[PDB]
Design a protein around this ligand. Structure first.
Ligand SMILES: [Fe+3]
Ligand SMILES: [Fe+3]
Ligand SMILES: [Fe+3]
Ligand SMILES: [Fe+3]
Lengths: 200, 233, 233, 200, 233, 200, 200
C-alpha cells in the first residue's frame, strides 16, 4: 500500500511543562502576551460561566502537574480561530493544576450548538486535551453540561459511547461560585469512574 | 470563523508510544484502562487556533538574550514543519523549554544540585515562516538525573510543542542530540517501540547552518498528520 | 639515584600521528624536514622523575572545588594506567587541563565570545594509586571554534599528560567523548591515520561509576610503552 | 608475530598547554608546589649555570607557546629521580616560551658524565623534550656544551649522527649573563640549521 | 550596488583536488607551501558580478556556427546549475572551451600534429535561464597527448567556467564523457582523491535530448556552493 | 550530521585558458562584447591608476600563462555588480600573462573603504583570483596599497595574518608609468616571500 | 558505554523452598546449626518484641508458602554482621508462613537509629526480603513502628514515597501477644493497600 512520511512521535510533556506553557503558573516572569485561561472578556456576548475541576490518577490521587488545552465555539456555535488578546472572545485557551492549586479554572461563555459532518447537531461542548508527566501521548475528551439534558440525549458523539454509564463521565455538574454560574468537571485518568477519551 | 474543509490522516498508535510503558514508572497510574472511543472528524476536531496575530517579543526565540550571557555550548536549533504529504505548515506556533547547561530547570520543584545560571531562563517560542521554517538560539542542555530507576538519567533534550492547523495535529514531543549514548538507556525514549520512530526524534549536527567562531547548529524537522480535502462525503 | 635496569618497547610511529599533517595548518611550519636519529637506550633515556613526594593539595584532582559551583554537566573521569604488557603503572603523575562548559579557556589568549565561569579554573593533577588508578571530578567541556579551516570546531576534549616510569614513556594526549559527532571532522584527530588508534582516545560512558542523582562518569584507560628487563646485553 | 596492547596515541599539547603545565607562565594562580625552572638551589654542589634559548619554526619565526621538560644528572653524574622541592637539586624540570617571554631559562648545574649501556662515557648533556601547538608528538633532543670539545668528540651518541655539520646543532654556546656563566641553546624545528631530534 | 545579505557553505578542500599532486608535474612548482589563511566572509567575498546585461551574440553558444560545418560528432551539451541546497542559479554566466575532433586546440602553443578544422573555433558562452538551465551545441572533442609522463593522454574533455552569485562561488572545472577509458589513467582527473568526486565530472549520454538523424546529447549538471541568509550575526 | 549535495569539484584551467577567457591575449578573433582589463572609463570618478605585476613559480621562474579575475569597490566604496560595457565603472574585470607579455595590467580607480560583517572598515583592497595550468583550484589573495599605512594597520583582515612579515606580501608598491599613477603587485606562488592566499 | 559481566538472573524460590531454607517449617530433620527466627536471646539489651504478620496475594488470599529474611541494627543502632548462634543478638534471621502456619513470627528487639549516607538519621526500621513461588525476583520492603511517629515524619527514606497514603503501608501496628509487646506487619503484594516495595 501507500505510506506517507510517518508523523513525528509524541513524548510526555514532563514535570516542568509549566515553565514552557504556563509561565505564571510556574511562578516565573511572563512575557507581554501569554495564552491563558480567560477566553471571554466581560463584554463578550453569551452566558458567562466559570469552569473548574481536579484531575485524578488511578490511585485516586490528585494530579498537581497537569496542563490542559481547550477549544470551543462562541455563543453562536462558531469557532473563532484568529487568536488575539484584543478579541472579546477567543475559542482557545490553556489552564493547569499546580502543587499550589490542585484545581484548574477557565473563564468563558457557554458554547452554541455545532453540527457534525453529517449535518446533525451536537450538544454544546468544550474539546479538551490533557497533558502531564506520565502521559506519553495526550488524552482528548469533551465537556458537556448537565443543564442541556434534552440536547445531550441526541448528541451523535455522546451516542457513540456504547455504555450509558460511561456517558455521564462527560457531564459537568452545574453549581455557583461567588454567586456565579460554574460547572465542575473532574477527570479520572484510570480506574473507577474512568473518564472517556477519544481518538480521531 | 473556522470551516470544516479538511480531514487528517488517522494516527498510527503503534508508531507513537503506548499509554502504559512500565519502565517509565509514572505512566502506570496515569494510563487509561479502557479503550479510547473513536469518533468521526467534525468541525470540532478539524479546526484550531491560528497564532499569526499573537504579539511576539523581539527575543522570544533567542534564549541567549531573553532572560550577561549564559554559560554553555552556543547552538542554533532549526528545521521545518511539514505534514505527512510533505506540505509545509506555515505560520504555526512552535514552543520550546529546556534545562541549563548543567541540566538544572528554572522551576521550584527542581532540586538537582547543579546550579541555576543567572542569565538563563530556558523558554522560547517561534512562528514558522511562509515555508514552514523555525529557528531558536540557545545553549545545549545537560543530561539530568531523575527518580525512576535508582540511576536513571535523561539524555540532553529540548521539550517541543507544535500547534499545526488543528487540534487534531497538536503535538508535544522531545528532541535529542546525535550520538548521545544516554539515548538508548532512557525509559521515556524506550516508551517508543519502533527504533525507526526513535530516529525521528534525533536532531543532526548541521555544520552548514553554523556561524564560524560563534555557534554550532542542529537540524530538527517535524512532521504533522497529513491534511487532505474532504471527498465524496 | 636511578639505575638503568629496563628497556622500553620501541614506539610505533605509524600508530602515533606523523609530524606533517597539513590539514592541521600549524603543523606545516613546526615539523622537522630531516629524519629522526635513532639511538640505543641508556640510563639517560630509561629513567625519569618519581613524583611520590610532591605535596598535592586536597582538591588538586577536583575541578568542582579547586577554583559557588561551576555550571555544566558534572562528571568523574577515571581509569587506569598500564604498560603494553598490561602491567599497572603505580604512583605516576597524571595532569589534565580543559575548557569550561561553553568551550572557553582561562587563558589570556582565549578570545572566544563564550563567557568564563567565575568558579572554574580547568586544571587538575592526580597520582595513580598502587593499582594504577586515577580519577578526577569536573564538568564536561564544550566544543570550541579555532582558526584552522573557516569553520573548524574541536570536539569536547580534555588534555592529558602522563609521566610513566621514564622520560621514554612520557606522553601528552587528548581524551574525546563517546558519540561526539565532531570527532570525525577534526583535523587534529585526523592527524592519526589509523581508525583503531582513534578509538583508543574515546572515553566511554560508565554508568557503573556514576553517583545517582549527582554526576555521570567516563572511563579512560591509558597505555604506556611496555617495560621489560634487559637480557643478554 | 606477537603484538602487545597498542600505546595510547599522542596528540598536540595545543595552544593552552600553559594552564595545565606552566601555571605562572600562564599567569594564573599557582598551587603550593609547582614543577618549574630551578633544578639547583644556591647551595647545590657543582658549577651553577644559566641556560637560555629561543625556539624557531620553519619560517624563522619565534615559537612563543612552547613547553620544554629537561632531565639531567647532578654534578657527580647521578640521576636524582626522587622529586622534592626540599632537595638542593632535582634532575627534572620544566620551562617555557611565552608571548611575554620569547626565551626560556633554566637554573641548574653542569651535569657530570654518565656511561651508556655498553659502559662508554657520554659527554655532559641535558635531555630535552619539546611540546607545542603544531607538534603532534613531542620532539627529543640533547644539549651539549661548547667547553667540552674533547668529551664531545668521543660521545657515542653524538657520534651516531652521520654528518659533522648536524652535530653542531646540539652544542650550547658559552656566554655570561650578569657575570653568571650561561650557555645559549637555540632550537630550529625546521629548515636551515634544523636541530637534530632523536628516536629511542 | 551589491549588499552583504548571504553566506556560503565553506568549501570541502578534501573533496576538491589538493594543490600538490605530484603526478601532475606542473603542480610541483605551482602549489603554495604555506597554509591558506581562513578569513570570515564579508561583502567583498559574498558579492560578484551579474552578467545579465552583457550583449551576447546569437551563436555565442553554438560552436557549429560561431566560427562550412566543422568535422566531428555533433552533440548538444546541456544541464542545470543549482547550489548545494538544490536551488537553481538563474542568469549565471557559463563559459566553455575545448579542442577540435582530433584533439587540436586553436592556440599558437598547440603543436600537436592533428590538423586544425577551418570551421572550428571551440569557444562558447551562455547565460543560464530562469530555471538555471544552459545549453551548447558543438562537436565531441578528441583526446590529446601532453608532455607529463612519456605517454600521457587527456581524456576527451570540455573546459568550463561558471560565475554563480559571488566570487565565493566562482569555479573552473572540466567535463569528461561517459565511458571514456582514458579517464582513470589521467593524473589531472587523479588530482581528485575521492572516486565519488570524479563521478561528478562525468557527462551522461542523454538520448531524450538528442535530435533524431541530427545530433546526440550529453547532460552535465553543476552544483555551486550552497547559499543561505545570515542569521544571529 | 546533515550533508548537502557535493559542490562540483575544481580542475586546472589548463594551458589554453586564454582561448576561452582571454581571446585577444590568445591572439584569436574576439566577440562583440568581452570582459577585460579596463574597469574604469576616463570619466569614472576617483583616482585613476594602473595596476601591474608578474607571477612567479616556486623556482622563481615567470608564469606566462596565468589568468586573473578582479573584484573591487568603486571610489565611493560601493560594489557595482550590474556588469555593463556602457558603465563608466565596472567592479569586475579580467587580465592575464602570456608568452608575449609576462606582466599583467589593469586600468581602474582606487577603491573606497567598505566595512566587514562586524561593521569595522577594511583598508582599500582589490580581491583577486588566480588560475593557470598546474593550479588545481584557484588561489585567492587581496591587493593593498603602500600609501595607506594608516588604514592597513587597522584592517581586520590584514590583522588576521599571524606574522607581520607575511602581511607585506599583500602590499602593492607605488610607482609611475608614463608619469601615470601605478602600483606594482608581484605574486609569488611558492617559496621565498610566498604570497598570502586566503580560504573563505 | 562500559558493560561489566551481567549478574546471574533471579528465579522464583519455588513451592519447596522450605526444604532448603526452613527445615523445621518443612517438617524435616534440622542440622546442628540453623538460621531461624530468634534474633535476640532473652538477655540481649534493648526492648524485646514479637513481630508477626500475614502475606496476601492480589485476590486477598493468604500466601502460605512465603519465606522472609530480615536485616536490622541492634538496640544501639549497630549492625552485627558476625553471625553466631552463641551471640546474644544477631542482626539477621529467617522466617516463613506455612500451610500449618499462615502467620510468620520473629523474636527481636526494637532497632536503634542509623544515619543514611548523607548523615541524616533514619527512623527505626527492619529490612525485609520476601520470596515465594510466583515471585520471580524477591521483593524488598521496610517495617517501621507506629509508636515512632516523630522519627517517621522525618525519615529520609519514608519521605521518598510520593503519596502519604502509601507510607502507611510500611507502619507496623503495636499490639500485645500473651501480654507481651508485639507489632503486626501484614504485607499485601498486590491491589488494595498494596505494600510499598523498594529497588536499590
Ligand atoms: Fe525535561
Ligand atoms: Fe584544547
Ligand atoms: Fe584542455
Ligand atoms: Fe524445584
Amino acid at each position: 500500500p501507500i505510506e506517507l512520511l510517518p508523523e513525528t512521535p509524541s513524548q510526555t510533556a514532563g514535570p516542568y511543562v509549566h515553565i514552557g506553557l504556563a509561565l505564571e503558573a510556574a511562578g516565573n516572569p511572563t512575557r507581554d502576551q501569554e495564552i491563558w485561561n480567560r477566553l471571554a472578556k466581560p463584554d463578550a456576548p453569551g452566558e458567562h460561566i466559570l469552569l473548574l475541576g481536579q484531575v485524578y490518577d488511578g490511585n485516586g490521587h490528585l494530579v498537581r502537574d497537569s496542563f490542559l488545552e481547550v477549544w470551543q465555539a462562541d455563543a453562536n456555535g462558531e469557532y473563532q480561530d484568529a487568536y488575539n488578546l484584543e478579541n472579546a472572545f477567543n475559542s482557545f485557551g490553556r489552564t493547569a493544576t499546580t502543587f499550589d492549586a490542585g484545581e484548574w479554572t477557565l473563564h468563558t461563555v457557554k458554547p452554541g450548538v455545532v453540527n457534525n459532518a453529517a449535518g446533525v447537531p451536537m450538544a454544546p461542548h468544550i474539546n479538551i486535551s490533557l497533558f502531564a508527566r506520565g502521559i506519553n501521548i495526550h488524552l482528548h475528551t469533551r465537556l458537556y453540561f448537565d443543564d442541556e439534558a434534552q440536547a445531550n440525549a441526541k448528541c451523535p458523539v455522546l451516542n457513540l459511547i456504547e455504555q450509558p454509564q460511561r456517558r455521564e463521565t462527560l457531564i459537568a455538574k452545574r453549581c455557583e461560585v461567588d454567586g456565579k454560574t460554574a460547572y465542575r468537571f473532574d477527570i479520572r485518568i484510570q480506574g473507577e469512574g474512568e473518564t472517556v477519551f477519544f481518538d480521531f | 470563523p473556522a470551516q470544516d474543509n479538511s480531514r487528517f490522516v488517522i494516527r498510527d498508535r503503534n508508531w507513537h508510544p503506548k499509554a502504559l510503558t512500565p519502565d517509565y514508572k509514572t505512566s502506570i497510574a496515569r494510563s487509561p484502562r479502557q479503550a479510547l472511543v473513536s469518533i468521526p472528524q467534525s468541525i470540532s476536531e478539524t479546526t484550531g487556533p491560528n497564532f499569526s496575530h499573537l504579539g511576539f517579543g523581539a527575543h522570544d526565540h533567542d534564549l541567549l538574550l531573553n532572560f550577561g550571557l549564559p554559560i554553555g555550548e552556543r547552538i542554533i536549533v532549526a528545521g521545518r514543519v511539514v505534514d505527512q504529504y510533505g506540505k509545509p505548515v506555515p505560520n504555526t506556533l512552535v514552543e520550546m523549554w529546556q534545562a541549563n547547561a548543567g541540566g538544572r530547570y528554572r522551576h521550584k520543584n527542581d532540586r538537582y544540585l547543579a546550579p541555576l545560571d543567572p542569565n538563563f531562563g530556558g523558554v522560547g517560542r517561534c512562528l514558522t515562516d511562509s515555508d514552514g521554517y523555525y529557528s531558536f538560539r540557545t545553549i545545549k542542555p545537560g543530561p539530568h538525573p531523575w527518580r525512576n530507576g535508582p540511576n536513571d538519567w535523561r539524555p540532553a533534550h529540548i521539550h517541543f510543542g507544535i500547534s499545526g492547523p488543528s487540534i487534531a495535529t497538536k503535538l508535544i514531543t522531545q528532541l535529542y542530540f546525535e550520538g548521545d549514548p544516554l539515548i538508548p538507556m532512557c525509559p521515556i525514549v524506550k516508551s517508543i517501540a519502533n527504533p525507526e520512530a526513535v530516529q525521528q526524534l534525533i536532531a543532526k549536527l548541521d555544520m552548514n547552518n553554523a556561524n564560524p567562531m560563534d555557534c554550532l547548529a542542529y537540524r530538527f524537522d517535524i512532521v504533522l498528520r497529513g491534511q487532505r480535502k474532504t471527498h465524496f462525503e
